[PDB]
């Protein structure tokens, strides 16, 4: 097989959705990311994920 | 003295403004984190295919 470097060839996450309009709001010490396009709301900690 | 158009007199509002808007018709698209296909492909081997 043709060898490729591991770091740029694998991807333990997969691009699942591309949201044009993802509103982000802060409430209750958490971030709500709401997309009307896919009708989906996610909740995250206020801190960025390294 | 003379006749006057209504708009010529400032009007004070005796009505309480209750603004009620309907909820937007919202369409829920088929959204799946993993399709039955992705899930079938997630298997490292398929006995059927093999």
From Swiss-Prot, chain A:
Envelope glycoprotein that forms spikes at the surface of virion envelope and binds to the host cell entry receptors MYH9/NMMHC-IIA and MYH10/NMMHC-IIB, promoting the virus entry into host cells. Essential for the initial attachment to heparan sulfate moieties of the host cell surface proteoglycans. Involved in fusion of viral and cellular membranes leading to virus entry into the host cell: following initial binding to its host cell entry receptors, membrane fusion is mediated by the fusion machinery composed at least of gB and the heterodimer gH/gL. Belongs to the herpesviridae glycoprotein B family. This is Envelope glycoprotein B. Homotrimer; disulfide-linked. Interacts with host receptor MYH9/NMMHC-IIA. Interacts with host receptor MYH10/NMMHC-IIB. Interacts with the host coreceptor PILRA. Binds to heparan sulfate proteoglycans. Interacts with gH/gL heterodimer. Interacts with gD. It comes from Human herpesvirus 1 (strain F). It is found in: Virion membrane; Host cell membrane; Host endosome membrane; Host Golgi apparatus membrane. The lineage of its organism: Viruses, Duplodnaviria, Heunggongvirae, Peploviricota, Herviviricetes. The cytoplasmic tail is phosphorylated by the viral kinase US3. Phosphorylation may be linked to a down-regulation of gB expression on cell surface. ubiquitinated. Glycans are attached at residue 45. The chain holds residues 353 to 402 of 903 of the full protein.
